[PDB]
Structures are given as structure tokens and as C-alpha cells.
């Protein structure tokens, strides 16, 4: 009876493939053919943020587009004032092994997590004047690879146990559990309306989840290796995934399959982080080859290179107003670019 | 100066944060990082216990004015290639192998062979090209009596030696050491421990001292 279900699943996959092929009449490279190229994009380093002593694994900007938070293996979570390079805060982490960090949209809280399988939320605005560990969320059986704030009380976390979770912070319990991935979930991105979110895993697939229902709406499979990063398009109707096969891929939610592939012959290293510009026309991707490329999202042509780091570019972020792009690498330096 | 009074005070706060970060980094850089690895039931628990006597589990201890950190990844059920680069730059790797596992199977093949496979994966990993391994061959007393009645030929069909502790143990050590492809960059320290010995932390101290001497010679350019 198991074979009957297996053949039903494979014929349903064939139906999925045929349905996707039916709704593919012209490629993206044909529609974006006569549009003007972006041209060579020269972005120079405006600020360099020093003070981390080990390799940096994550960063997040925040809504004010001025402050930012960075997490490093030295055990410090540093909130920087990017305009003046001042260190607003330096939180000593309980566990030195941190590989994700998020900054709340309100700015009152900051989250971190890593190999300790715990998501720690710290209260930045305390009456005592210090930064206290507001909450410790436990329940994942694998390392926390990403975490994003829905609001001051709800947080979505992805873990290496092939599972995502939605937590109510004040209660500390998992409001919802998202299952279906067969590999470690490496990154997640929240929709602009924060009602859906996409998670990329090590099974070379990306899944779209509904926050309310808790179920997976769509699955996208175009990569040939581990998906390390994911990011929605600004309009929320598409997303981009960077993987270990040295390719990025733009997928569409409404059409349900892949739109564009961003790759180059001389690029053979994986992508650690992807991000979109304010208008979505530029896709910025950090690579293992010490660099960070800037692709034309519509034309797939490479538009620029951000070569300023002496080690792997591990984290990448773009401000909400789009003024600057911050890249944090394994040489313990963040760099602001315009 | 264009700064305001509040801006000057913020810069002073940033400078204090800088000096506290420098002090914390100076304190942490004087501490030895050991990554503890091994198969299930190899004897990592016994090693952690012996060090204590003299997600991720961290063990702190002190010996001869050196502070030692062990990171027992242990119950981290995930792909090692997604988080093993976090431990690049540790002072040493402590690998635990159970000798008694030479004739035990999980699958239907010897546990010693998974020990060899994971040792080959870790020793020859691209991140740990310069990191030195500290191989622990635990359960010497169990092996000494197992070998008297169960030939080593179960695990090694090509072993032509006698069923004696010394020859079989040397052969197993040689088989594990042959998996080292980075002979010139890294060196492997092998110690034959048990559950009832007290010289393990001394051996870790000596191996770490040798690693520190070699690292200092590299820093000076004399190596």
C-alpha cells in the first residue's frame, strides 16, 4: 500500500510540473529584454565598524535605518549607530555560538540564537539602564539558523531540526510549528505584510508558509544544493534564494515556479546571504569568494562588485529606506556601502 | 569640534564600550579552545568527567595556569557541514575512540569503522587543516580482555599480528594515524586512556603546550 501512495505522489508531482509548464508562455528574460540596463554600479565604503574580535555571522538593520545589530562568535551582540560608528550597546551573550540575530521593528528588543538551540530576546529599553535577557525560547532540537520579529510579542525562528516555529514571546511557548522540510532550514524571510513567510532549507527547496494556518502553501525546487539565504521582493509577490551551487534564483509566488537564474561561469562558491534593493531592481548577494556581487534583478546581468572584505561575507542587509547596504564578513568588520 | 555635548558623551560611552570589549577579548584570547568529538558511546562522557575531576555543552577547567574550554557538540542532530566552520580556529580537537567497539556493530558493520570514517572526515576537513587532533583510545581494559577471546581480524581482515594488547593496540593506532592526509600541517597526539586513570588532563596539557610552542614558532617565522 506504500507503493500505491508513492506512485500517487509521483503522479501528483508530474501534475504539478505540467501545471507549471502550462503557465509559462514567455520567460522573464524575454519580457525584460528591451528595457534599459542599470549600468555599472559603483558603491564605495562609507563607514567601517570595528570592535568585533571574532567572525561575524549575522546582522540586522532595523526600521529607523540608522541603528543596526551585529552578532559575532566572540560572544558579543553589538548595536551600532551606523551614522557615527558609535557603539550604542554591547550585550554579552550567554552562549558564544551565535549565528543569527534580529532587531525588532519597534527597536525595543533584539533577538539572537545559534548552536545552543535557544532564541534569546533582550530588552533594549529597560528602566535600569542596562540590557536584560527578556526571554529565552527553547524547543528546537537543532541550531537556530534565522529568526525574525513579527512584532514585539511574536517571533518566527528557523532551526536545523528541519522545522520552523512561531513563538509568543510573553508566554514563551511555540504558537505554531511549521514542518515539511526534509533538511536543515538555513534562512527565512518575512513578507512585507508579515502574513506569509518563505523558508529555504538544505533539501534544495523553499517553502511558503501561512502564519495563521500554519501550513505550507507552495514549494519551489530549482536549486541543486543547500539554500543558504532567502529574501522577498519588496512587493511581496516573489522571492530570491541563494544556494551553495553558486547560483541565485528568483521565484514567483503567483506563477509558482522559477523566474530567473543569476549565475556566472567564474563564480563557483556558494552564496551566504541575499538581499533586495528598495525598488527590487538590484539583488545583492554575498559570496564565499570574499566578495559581494550586485545583480540586475530584471536582466540577470551582473551590475557591480562590492570587494572590500578579507574573509567570507557572512551577512548582508539593506536599510528600509534603501540608502545604504551593510556587509558583515568573517574578518570581524562590518562595512556600510553607498 | 562639531560634536554636541550629548554627542561627546555618546562618543565617550562608545570608547568605554571599546575598552571593555578589548579587555574581554584579551581575557578570552588567553583561553584554550578544545573541540570534543567522537562516536556514540565512545567515552566522551568519561573524558569530560576526568577533566572535571582535575544543544552545545561547554566545560571549563584549569590546569597549570591554563584555562581550558571544551565544546561537546554531542547532541547536535544536524549536518556538521553547516556549523563546523564555527569551530575553525580552536586550539585543538579531542577525538574519542572506544577500543572495545572494534567488534561491535550498530546497520550491520563495525562501530570502529564509523569511528574511522568520522575521524577521516574531521581530520581531513578543509577547516581543520592546521588544527591538531588529540586522539583518545578509551576502554583499554575492556579491549585488553576482548582481544584475548575475539580476534582483531573481525575489524581488520588484513591484520596478520597476534592477539595481544600491545600489537593490536599499536596496529589500531597506526590505522587511525594513517587517515591523516595533512601530515606536514597537523600532528596527531595519541593517548591510551581508560575509565580509571588520572593522567588524561596532564596529557591534554602537554599536547596543548606542544601546539602552543609550534604556533608561537609559526608566529615568529622560525617554523
Amino acid at each position: 500500500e506504500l507503493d500505491q501512495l508513492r506512485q500517487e505522489a509521483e503522479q501528483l508531482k508530474n501534475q504539478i510540473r505540467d501545471a507549471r509548464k502550462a503557465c509559462a508562455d514567455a520567460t522573464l528574460s524575454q519580457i525584460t529584454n528591451n528595457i534599459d540596463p542599470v549600468g555599472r554600479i559603483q558603491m564605495r565604503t562609507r563607514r567601517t565598524l570595528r570592535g568585533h574580535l571574532a567572525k561575524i555571522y549575522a546582522m540586522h538593520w532595523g526600521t529607523d535605518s540608522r541603528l543596526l545589530v551585529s552578532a559575532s562568535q566572540d560572544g558579543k551582540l553589538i548595536i551600532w549607530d551606523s551614522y557615527t560608528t558609535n557603539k550604542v550597546h554591547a550585550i554579552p551573550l550567554r552562549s558564544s555560538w551565535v549565528m543569527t540575530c534580529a532587531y525588532a521593528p519597534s527597536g525595543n528588543y533584539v533577538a539572537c540564537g545559534g548552536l545552543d538551540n535557544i532564541c534569546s530576546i533582550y530588552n533594549l529599553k529597560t528602566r535600569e539602564g542596562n540590557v536584560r535577557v527578556s526571554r529565552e525560547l527553547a524547543g528546537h532540537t537543532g541550531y537556530l539558523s534565522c529568526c525574525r520579529f513579527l512584532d514585539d510579542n511574536q517571533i518566527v525562528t528557523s532551526s536545523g531540526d528541519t522545522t520552523c516555529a512561531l513563538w509568543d514571546i510573553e508566554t514563551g511557548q511555540q504558537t505554531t510549528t511549521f514542518t515539511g522540510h526534509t533538511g536543515d532550514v538555513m534562512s527565512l524571510s518575512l513578507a512585507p505584510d508579515t502574513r506569509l513567510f518563505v523558508s529555504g532549507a538544505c533539501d534544495a527547496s523553499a517553502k511558503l508558509w501561512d502564519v495563521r494556518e500554519g501550513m505550507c502553501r507552495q514549494t519551489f525546487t530549482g536549486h541543486e544544493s543547500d539554500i543558504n539565504a532567502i529574501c522577498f521582493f519588496p512587493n511581496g509577490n516573489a522571492f530570491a534564494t541563494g544556494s551553495d551551487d553558486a547560483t541565485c534564483r528568483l521565484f514567483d509566488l503567483r506563477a509558482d515556479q522559477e523566474l530567473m537564474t543569476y549565475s556566472h561561469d567564474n563564480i563557483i562558491c556558494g552564496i551566504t546571504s541575499v538581499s533586495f534593493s528598495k525598488s527590487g531592481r538590484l539583488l545583492l548577494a554575498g559570496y564565499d569568494d570574499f566578495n559581494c556581487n550586485v545583480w540586475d534583478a530584471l536582466k540577470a546581468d551582473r551590475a557591480g562588485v562590492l570587494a572590500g572584505h578579507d574573509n567570507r561575507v557572512s551577512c548582508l542587509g539593506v536599510t528600509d529606506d534603501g540608502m545604504a547596504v551593510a556587509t558583515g564578513s568573517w574578518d570581524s568588520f562590518l562595512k556600510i556601502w553607498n | 569640534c562639531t560634536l554636541s555635548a550629548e554627542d561627546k558623551a555618546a562618543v565617550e560611552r562608545s570608547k568605554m564600550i571599546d575598552r571593555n570589549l578589548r579587555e574581554d577579548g584579551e581575557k578570552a584570547a588567553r583561553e584554550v579552545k578544545l573541540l570534543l568529538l567522537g562516536a556514540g558511546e565512545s567515552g566522551k562522557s568519561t573524558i569530560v568527567k576526568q577533566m572535571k575531576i582535575i544543544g552545545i555543552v561547554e566545560t571549563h577547567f584549569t590546569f597549570k595556569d591554563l584555562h581550558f574550554k571544551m565544546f561537546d557538540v554531542g547532541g547536535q542532530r544536524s549536518e556538521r557541514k553547516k556549523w563546523i566552520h564555527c569551530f575553525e580556529g580552536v586550539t585543538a580537537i579531542i577525538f574519542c575512540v572506544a577500543l572495545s567497539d572494534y567488534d561491535l556493530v550498530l546497520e550491520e558493520m563495525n562501530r570502529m569503522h564509523e569511528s574511522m570514517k568520522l575521524f577521516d572526515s574531521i581530520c581531513n576537513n578543509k577547516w581543520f587543516t592546521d588544527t591538531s587532533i588529540i586522539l583518545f583510545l578509551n576502554k583499554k581494559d575492556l579491549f585488553e580482555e576482548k582481544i584475548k577471546k575475539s580476534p582483531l581480524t573481525i575489524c581488520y581482515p588484513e591484520y596478520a599480528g597476534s592477539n595481544t594488547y600491545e600489537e593490536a593496540a599499536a596496529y589500531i593506532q597506526c590505522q587511525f594515524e594513517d587517515l591523516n592526509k595533512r601530515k606536514d600541517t597537523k600532528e596527531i597526539y595519541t593517548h591510551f586512556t581508560c575509565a580509571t586513570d588520572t593522567k588524561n588532563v596532564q596529557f591534554v596539557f602537554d599536547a596543548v603546550t606542544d601546539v602552543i610552542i609550534k604556533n608561537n614558532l609559526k608566529d615568529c617565522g622560525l617554523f
Partner: single-chain antibody
Amino acid sequence: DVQLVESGGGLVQPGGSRKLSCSASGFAFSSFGMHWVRQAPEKGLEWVAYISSGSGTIYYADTVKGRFTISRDDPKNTLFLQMTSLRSEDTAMYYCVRSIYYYGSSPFDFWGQGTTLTVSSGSDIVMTQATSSVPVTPGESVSISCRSSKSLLHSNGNTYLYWFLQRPGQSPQLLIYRMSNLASGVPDRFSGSGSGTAFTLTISRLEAEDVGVYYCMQHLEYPLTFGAGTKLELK
């Protein structure tokens, strides 16, 4: 919660010496700069001294420079003001005020209870509060105006204006910091506005506990100066 206690005040002969101690609890004392602020018996507030976190920078008012010395013991969580050559014009109530400085912080957040000292028998921004007092009725709207000799708007866009309320028999309370931002725990009735040298504080639907003296403060050029104060009384 956070609380500061002032001690060491009393009757002192002219030309004498005294030691005022502010003991802090409930907050990270080492991370806060500390101000000593003076209030004469029948007059308004006047800034006296300041010592930063880590004692890196120390400032005094030109009135008390040389005679007064401010220090802090972080492990003891205490703040000292040593006063020498006491003049008859130093008789007043002294407050220790905590103040933390980073991006988006609220300096002068908490004031101490104050200790009473009774001495027995240009180039500074002049904040002007023209109106000494106004009559008010509960449920109405009142506006308290302020003026500055020099523009308080900096090149970084921050307008360094602070508003305080001192209810009768109580220490001053921070309402507005940097001319726009509401302090934590302050009702949203109070709103700060203005630009450059002219400033105003607006209270909408004032309640019975809004009765007191409202002070105008600048934080741009470091010789900190207060306004004369604008008393509010009912009818």
C-alpha cells in the same frame, strides 16, 4: 524601582565645608553620568556639577568652580559633592540626577529626593520663560512658552531642549527631552514643539496633578542653564 537618596545637608557656617552623598539603587549606576543640580529656596533650578560614566569628563558651573568637587564610587554606587569655602549664596536644595547618553536615550530621566543645605549668617545660553505664572482650569488646554538666546538646533538635527515639571513638595520630573520626545511614563497630553530659539510646551485636557512649576532647559552648550520657571495654579 530606581531611587536616589541625598544625605549630608544641614546648617553650615560661612566659609565651611560639607560632603553631600547620593546613594543610588535600582539601576546600573556605573553606566549613568551624574549631575548635581541646585534649587535656591524661593528661586528656580540651577545646574552645579557633572561627572560622566567612568569619570572621564567632569564639568562645573562657573559659580562653584574651584570650591566644589564632584566624584563617584561605582562599586559603592554612590556620588559625592565636596563643598569648600561655602558662601551664603550656596544655601539651597541639592538633587542628584542620573543621565545616560547614547542614540535615542533620555537624559535627566530620574531625579533624587534632594538634600537641604543652609549656609548660616556672559557666553552662556539664557533661557527665558517670560510668564511667571498662569491660572488654569482642569480639563482645559494650556501652553507654556520658552525662549533661548542662542539657537538650540544642532547640525545633526537634534534640538537640545528639555522640559521638566516640579510638583509642589516634589523633585522635578522629566516630561519632554530634545523638544519633541515624551519621557517614559508621561501621559500623552504633554506635547513639545518649537524651532530654533522659540519653544512651547502644550498640555491638552490638563488634570489636577499637572499643577506645578514648568522649567525650560538647554543641553547644547555644556554650561547647562535652566529657565526661570512657569508656575501653574488653579482657580
